[PDB]
Amino acid sequence: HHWGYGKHNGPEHWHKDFPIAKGERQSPVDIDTHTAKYDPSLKPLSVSYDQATSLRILNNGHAFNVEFDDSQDKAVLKGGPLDGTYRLIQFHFHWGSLDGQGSEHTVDKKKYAAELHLVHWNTKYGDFGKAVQQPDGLAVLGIFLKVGSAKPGLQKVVDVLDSIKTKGKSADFTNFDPRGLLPESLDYWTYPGSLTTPPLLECVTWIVLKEPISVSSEQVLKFRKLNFNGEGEPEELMVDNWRPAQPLKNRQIKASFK
Ligand SMILES: NS(=O)(=O)c1cc2c(s1)S(=O)(=O)N(c1cccc(O)c1)C(CN1CCOCC1)=C2
Ligand SMILES: [Hg+2]
Ligand SMILES: [Zn+2]
């Protein structure tokens, strides 16, 4: 009928409509810290989120997304393993029904409670739709969320979820500052991969941050109260919207730290 994360249309079934699911550079993967190569030539990451304009938040039946105005270079990502400027277009989360699962990427087989993806596209390509047609079209900055203390920067997002409860609802979400979702250190691992949901396009340079952010259980708890279904349909709680780790194949994960 259409992809989802349940018994009948979950990740295991995705390959039927999206053949690329069994490709060479699929994500997410398991980061084995003892095999990752320290690379002294990688540049430090440069995140310029000082003029970001958030527009709205919407429930799309797969997760919730905060969209930004990417008409010009207001919020960008440069440095690290990248070439050229990438524009912030949207961020979303993946989470679980329990605190010991939720993240897509794992560290030494360790699963975190949730995972934040800040999606950017390569400006040299003109618009998002063109960028998705290239090997170095996307750069997704991933951050792990660990349950502990509350993150002030996340509360604004948490407070508005009630107005976008079911599939297809949206609420205006202006003046949100993304810099509030960053950890202290910008150290990372990097590898060539893909989107973690259909169409599963292999156009992503993944930059996973080493240091996770803290989020209270009450904050994550509100994520689990969202709905996969639209208004009027039977209720199905939005939880465990994450894809299992894929085989690394012939790839190498470089670390920007020792
Ligand atoms: N989890 S993830 O980081 O690996 C991403 C999954 C998707 C990302 S990133 S996305 O931002 O690139 N894109 C997306 C999602 C919501 C809004 C938007 O403008 C784009 C879609 C749906 N998208 C339709 C057009 O072709 C590519 C895929 C899925
Ligand atoms: Hg691509
Ligand atoms: Zn994602």
Swiss-Prot record:
Changing N65L: Reduced activity. Changing N60V: Reduced activity. Its cofactor is Zn(2+); Co(2+). Optimum pH is 6-8. Zn(2+) binds at H92, H94, H117. The record marks Q90 as: Involved in the binding of some activators, including histamine and L-histidine. Substrate binds at T196, T197. GO terms for biological process: angiotensin-activated signaling pathway; carbon dioxide transport; morphogenesis of an epithelium; neuron cellular homeostasis; positive regulation of cellular pH reduction; positive regulation of dipeptide transmembrane transport; positive regulation of synaptic transmission, GABAergic; regulation of chloride transport. Changing H117 to D/N/Q: Reduced activity. Changing E115Q: Strongly reduced activity and sulfonamide affinity. It catalyses: hydrogencarbonate + H(+) = CO2 + H2O; urea = cyanamide + H2O. Residues 1-257 form the Alpha-carbonic anhydrase domain. CDD domains: alpha_CA_I_II_III_XIII (cd03119). Pfam families: Carb_anhydrase. Changing K16E: In Jogjakarta. The record marks Y5, N60, N65 as: Fine-tunes the proton-transfer properties of H-64. Changing E104D: Normal CO(2) hydrase activity. One of its GO terms (molecular function) is zinc ion binding. Interacts with SLC4A4. Interaction with SLC4A7 regulates SLC4A7 transporter activity. Interacts with SLC26A6 isoform 4 (via C-terminus cytoplasmic domain). It is linked to Osteopetrosis, autosomal recessive 3: A rare genetic disease characterized by abnormally dense bone, due to defective resorption of immature bone. Osteopetrosis occurs in two forms: a severe autosomal recessive form occurring in utero, infancy, or childhood, and a benign autosomal dominant form occurring in adolescence or adulthood. Recessive osteopetrosis commonly manifests in early infancy with macrocephaly, feeding difficulties, evolving blindness and deafness, bone marrow failure, severe anemia, and hepatosplenomegaly. This is Carbonic anhydrase 2. The lineage of its organism: Eukaryota, Metazoa, Chordata, Craniata, Vertebrata.
